Amino acid sequence: HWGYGKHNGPEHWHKDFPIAKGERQSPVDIDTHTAKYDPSLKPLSVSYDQATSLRILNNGHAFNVEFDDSQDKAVLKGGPLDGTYRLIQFHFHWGSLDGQGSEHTVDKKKYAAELHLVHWNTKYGDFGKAVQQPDGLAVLGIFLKVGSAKPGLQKVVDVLDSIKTKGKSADFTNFDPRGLLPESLDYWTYPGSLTTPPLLECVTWIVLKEPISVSSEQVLKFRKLNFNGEGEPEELMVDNWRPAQPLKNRQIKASFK
Ligand SMILES: [Zn+2]
């Protein structure tokens, strides 16, 4: 099955998921000089005050912090978006080394990791229906660099030992995703895809310009996770990122000058 090894990594995915070679695949390189300011964007609205986290799951390719998405509790609106998008989960992609790990790049620069806050358009009723639509999802992407600790990340880091291996979950209530955001909401946006199989072309990407800083120790804890299940050969969950895909007939827009 697909993964991030030599034998089953991104360069193989097209065999089972031909949309891997599609017209609007993600991630992409963000060429900051060619992105264009778009006056027509609306201000981004990130409304996370009423968020209800539920659980954290090691799904074998990342860990997802899952939310109650049965009401409009944690929603994204504005920016390029029409309508209301509900937070369903967030997860990260990260490297084996601090010099790689992000999926998007900025002028070819790779960050140590990238946070994806995944939201679905409430007009489509559930996530599964939303991923079948061209405007089904909105994913807020945030780069991570290594420097100072991120205090709002620590609660995530410290539960990771309980979900070391694929298929493990743990209760994860009362986590506040506001503690993962940078100061600025300036962003780039473009139409793209899921970055994991099934690679569906259903995402409006909103990638923040300002990275967050995490500590060495925090990223090192990400790197102790396992891709494998308990009782299978240990394979560290590292380098779980898809590289940049061709931009094709897309323009990246900026919210800022
Ligand atoms: Zn992701």
UniProtKB/Swiss-Prot annotation:
Name this protein carries in UniProt: Carbonic anhydrase 2
Keyword Acetylation assigned: yes
Catalytic activity entry: hydrogencarbonate + H(+) = CO2 + H2O; urea = cyanamide + H2O
Effect the entry attributes to changing residue 195 to D/E: Strongly reduced activity, but enhanced zinc affinity
Subunit structure as annotated in this protein's UniProt entry: Interacts with SLC4A4. Interaction with SLC4A7 regulates SLC4A7 transporter activity. Interacts with SLC26A6 isoform 4 (via C-terminus cytoplasmic domain).
Comment on pH dependence: Optimum pH is 6-8.
Positions annotated to bind Zn(2+): 91, 93, 116
Cellular compartment(s): Cytoplasm; Cell membrane
PTM sites of type Phosphoserine: 162, 169
Class of enzymatic activity (EC top level): lyase
Phenotype upon changing residue 4 to H: Reduced proton transfer rate
Disulfide-linked positions: none
Gene Ontology molecular-function annotations: arylesterase activity; carbonate dehydratase activity; cyanamide hydratase activity; zinc ion binding
Consequence of substituting residue 196 to H: Higher affinity for bicarbonate. Enhanced proton transfer capacity
SUPFAM superfamilies per UniProt: Carbonic anhydrase
Stated family: Belongs to the alpha-carbonic anhydrase family.
Outcome, altering residue 103 to A/Q: Strongly reduced CO(2) hydrase activity
Job of this protein: Catalyzes the reversible hydration of carbon dioxide. Can also hydrate cyanamide to urea. Stimulates the chloride-bicarbonate exchange activity of SLC26A6. Essential for bone resorption and osteoclast differentiation. Involved in the regulation of fluid secretion into the anterior chamber of the eye. Contributes to intracellular pH regulation in the duodenal upper villous epithelium during proton-coupled peptide absorption.
Reported impact of residue 59 to A: Reduced activity
Note accompanying the cofactor annotation: Zinc. Can also use cobalt(II) with lower efficiency, but not copper(II), nickel(II) and manganese(II).
Cofactor(s) this protein cannot do without: Zn(2+); Co(2+)
Outcome after substituting residue 118 to A/G/I/L/S: Reduced CO(2) hydrase and p-nitrophenyl acetate esterase activities
Domain Alpha-carbonic anhydrase: 1-256
Effect of residue 59 to D: Strongly reduced activity
